[PDB]
Ligand binder design. Structure first.
Ligand SMILES: *C/C=C(C)/C=C/C=C(C)/C=C/C1=C(C)CCCC1(C)C
Length: 133
């Protein structure tokens, strides 16, 4: 319920292109990223997280300690500097990324076998569902 450890296989991905567009990802690369199968690998140890979301051409990596603000440079995404902070709101893992973009961050709900991930930027929300492999 608070345990996010695992290798996570995607089963659905809603409004992916609206969220990428809100981040200003190149329209060309958007309709490549649309094609790619993603595997989310989470290593969680106490407060310390290592998140690795992987695909053929394109990976997103982040490591953080819950409750410790960190500078994040989204080099493989929109290549912006944000002030990221990840915390627990109940059993909901919440990341707020302060910077140019408003309403920017993500949330993870872990429901036994299922991981629900909502990514937000501006007025767009991308809803993803992964299953533990
Ligand atoms: C808790 C899980 C998180 C924060 C996972 C985030 C994953 C991404 C931001 C993935 C982004 C990607 C693209 C938009 C294009 C294709 C490659 C991806 C899947 C790494």
């Amino acid at each position: 319920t608070r345990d996010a450890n695992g290798t996570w296989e995607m089963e659905s991905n809603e409004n992916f292109e609206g969220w990428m567009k809100a981040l200003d990802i190149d329209f060309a690369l958007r309709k490549i990223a649309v094609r790619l199968t993603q595997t989310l690998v989470i290593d969680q140890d106490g407060d310390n997280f290592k998140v690795k979301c992987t695909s053929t051409f394109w990976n997103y990596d982040v490591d953080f300690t819950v409750g410790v603000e960190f500078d994040e440079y989204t080099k493989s995404l929109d290549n912006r500097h944000v002030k990221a902070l990840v915390t627990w709101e109940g059993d909901v893992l919440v990341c707020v990324q302060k910077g140019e973009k408003e309403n920017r961050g993500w949330k993870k709900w872990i429901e036994g076998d299922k991981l629900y991930l909502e990514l937000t930027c501006g007025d767009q929300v991308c809803r993803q569902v992964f299953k533990k492999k």
